[PDB]
Subunit: 100 residues, 4 copies
C-alpha cells in the first residue's frame, strides 16, 4: 500500500497550490512589479511553478512571495518524484513476482 | 515486462502532445494575447511544456488552454518519471544477481 | 541509513546555493547586461535555477557565471533525484516485508 | 556495475551537447529571429535545455533547430533520470545488505 502514499501527495500538492495560490497573492498584491496581483493569476503560477515549467510570465518579487514559491516548487518536485517512486517500486513488484 | 510500460508512456505522451497540440490551438486561437495561434506553434509548445523546459516564448492565456497545459505537463513529467522507474527497476534486476 | 544521504544533499545544495549565490554575484556584477548584480537577486536565482523553474527573469551572461550555473543546476537536479531515490528504496523496504 | 552506465550517460550527454550545440547553430544561424547565432551561445543553450531550466533567453525558431532541441532535452532528462536510478538501485544494495 505505497500508492496510498501517491494519492496523499496528489492531495497535499493541490492544497499547497490553493494554499500557495491564495497565500502568495496577498504576499505580492499591492507591491512594485507585482504580476501576481489577482488570485486567478497566482493560481496558474502555482501550477507553472510546481511543474517547474517556469514559462516566466509570472513570478514573485517580494521576499515573502519567493518563499511561498520555494514551498510550492519543492512540493511539486517532491510529489512527482514520489509518484516516480511508486511506479518503480511497483515494477520491482512484478520483477520479484516472477523470480520469487 | 515493465518496459512494455515504457513504450506505453512514449505513445501516450506523443498522443497527448498531438492531442494537446491540436486541442489547445482551438482553445486559444482567436482570443486576446493569443500566442498559440497556429497548430505548428502549439505543437512546439507541447514539447516545450511536457519537458517543462518552459522557455516561455509560448503559453496559454485562456482558462481552457491552461487545462490542456496541466494535462500535457503531468503527462510528460509522469512519462519520464516512469522511464526513470524502468531504468532503476532494471538495475535492481542485475543487483539481485 | 540511506536517509542519512538525503539530509546530506539538503545541506550540500543549500551550501551550493549560498556558494553559487555569493560566488556568481561577483562573477557577473559590473559586466554588461548583468542581471545578477545584487547578492539578494543572485540568491533567488540559485533557487530558481536549482529547481530548474527557470522563470528567466535572472540568468548569467558571463562565461563564468554560466559555470556557477551548471554547478547549481546539476546540484539541485542531483539532490532531488537523490531524495526521489530514498523515497523509492524505502517503498521496496515495505515491499520486501 | 550499473554505475558503468552512469558514466556512459555523462559522456553521451556531453556529446549530445557539443553535438546539438554545433549542430543547432548551423540549423538556425542566418534565419529570421535567430538568437542561436554563434556557437558559444548555442553551447549555453544546450546546457539550459538539457537541464530544462529553460530561462528562455535562447531557443530554436527553425523547424530543424527544434529537433536538435527535443533530442538535447530527452537526452538530459534521460541521463539524469538514469543517475537517479543508480542512486536508488544502490540504496537497495545496502537495504538487502541489512534485510538479509
Ligand atoms: C521536475 C523536473 N526535474 C527537476 C530536476 C527535471 C526532469 C525532475 C528530476
Ligand atoms: Rb524544468
Ligand atoms: Rb522561462
Ligand atoms: Rb523551466
Amino acid at each position: 500500500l505505497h500508492w496510498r502514499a501517491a494519492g496523499a501527495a496528489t492531495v497535499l500538492l493541490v492544497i499547497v497550490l490553493l494554499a500557495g495560490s491564495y497565500l502568495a497573492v496577498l504576499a505580492e498584491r499591492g507591491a512594485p512589479g507585482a504580476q501576481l496581483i489577482t488570485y486567478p493569476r497566482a493560481l496558474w503560477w502555482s501550477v507553472e511553478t510546481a511543474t517547474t515549467v517556469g514559462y516566466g510570465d509570472l513570478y514573485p518579487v517580494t521576499l515573502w512571495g519567493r518563499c511561498v514559491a520555494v514551498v510550492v516548487m519543492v512540493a511539486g518536485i517532491t510529489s512527482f518524484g514520489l509518484v516516480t517512486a511508486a511506479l518503480a517500486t511497483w515494477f520491482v513488484g512484478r520483477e520479484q513476482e516472477r523470480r520469487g
